Design a protein around this ligand. Structure first.
Ligand SMILES: O=C(O)[C@H](Cc1c[nH+]c[nH]1)[NH+]1CCOCC1
Length: 322
């Protein structure tokens, strides 16, 4: 029910300042862009939840199937009594891992780490009910800033699933893995999900579904800016575009102005213009090669001890240690 510890390192005013800075920088750049972290307000989070069930969006169900068939092996290899989730704690994937830890009579502690305190409370109540006696220590924070705030207690399995790591470009990605590695003690393990290079048609369709749900998700960042910064983006004026970048081997989401648009952002005393056909970058989703996952882990000071992948080779999970 209500048993919980929660530390909260995210302030509303600090988030508001960050949005103002990001939007100013992003909209005044010659090549316009917006950071994807701002996708995930309440509406955008619900849209992403729906995305995970789209026929075209294979990543979630593919990762889940790997966990479904190999969770016992993962938990045995980790030997952890504490599950740290860099993420909500709300998915069936979490429960697959917790179940396996319970089955092995190892489970003692759950540490959900996410940006929404309300979500963490909900996760804590649900998990607390399903695994009686489990200790829950929630951390409300940003995984690019507050990894050092994660408690160093027990033998910890830190999981970073869904190929979230792919939403970081190489420089911030390397910094993230290095920082994360620095927090691991002997006996701790990282479980990392990475979406893999594959048929490019399938990749593009995964980010441009027939039902237009990803398009709604993408355009919602404009609604976020409209509401929070008193802007007047016309969402109907922007086309959703998903591209495969073969040089960087990443999916990119863009918003393309159908016609010329004049946008006023009142909170920033700012006016910007979009030319007809002008495109604005809103997200990258890097796709990996198995050999390069090993390399990127190595550069961060982590040794991959286990590698799991579906029979189609669509998705991969790494276990890595110091
Ligand atoms: O790149 C993706 O596949 C998604 C974001 C996304 C899905 N569809 C469009 N963007 N990310 C992966 C795991 O959760 C965090 C976000």
């Amino acid at each position: 029910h209500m048993a919980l510890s929660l530390a909260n390192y995210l302030a509303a005013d600090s988030a508001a300042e960050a949005l103002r800075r990001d939007v100013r920088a992003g909209l005044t750049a010659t090549q316009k862009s917006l950071p994807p972290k701002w996708f995930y307000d309440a509406v955008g989070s619900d849209l992403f939840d729906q995305i995970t069930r789209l026929p075209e969006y294979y990543p979630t169900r593919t990762e889940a199937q790997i966990l479904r068939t190999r969770s016992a092996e993962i938990i045995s290899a980790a030997g952890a009594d504490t599950l740290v989730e860099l993420g909500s704690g709300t998915s069936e994937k979490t429960r697959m891992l917790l179940d396996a830890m319970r089955d092995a009579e190892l489970l003692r502690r759950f540490i959900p780490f996410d940006v929404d305190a309300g979500v963490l409370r909900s996760a804590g109540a649900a998990i607390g009910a399903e695994y009686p006696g489990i200790e829950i220590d929630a951390v409300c924070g940003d995984f690019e800033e507050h990894l050092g705030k994660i408690p160093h207690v027990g033998r910890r399995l830190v999981v970073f699933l869904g190929s979230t790591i792919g939403n970081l470009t190489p420089a911030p990605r390397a910094e993230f893995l290095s920082t994360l590695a620095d927090t691991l003690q002997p006996g701790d393990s990282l479980l990392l999900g990475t979406d893999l290079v594959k048929d490019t048609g399938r990749l593009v369709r995964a980010y441009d579904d027939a039902a237009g749900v990803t398009a709604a998700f993408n355009r919602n960042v404009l609604a976020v800016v409209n509401r929070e910064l008193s802007a007047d983006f016309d969402l109907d004026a922007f086309e959703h575009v998903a591209k495969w970048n073969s040089d960087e081997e990443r999916i990119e989401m863009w918003l393309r102005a159908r016609t010329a648009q004049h946008v006023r952002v009142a909170a920033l005393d700012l006016e910007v213009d979009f030319a007809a056909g002008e495109e604005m970058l809103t997200e990258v989703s890097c796709k990996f090669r198995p050999e390069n996952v090993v390399a990127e882990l190595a550069e961060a000071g982590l040794r991959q001890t286990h590698w799991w992948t579906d029979p189609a080779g669509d998705f991969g999970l790494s276990l890595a240690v110091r």
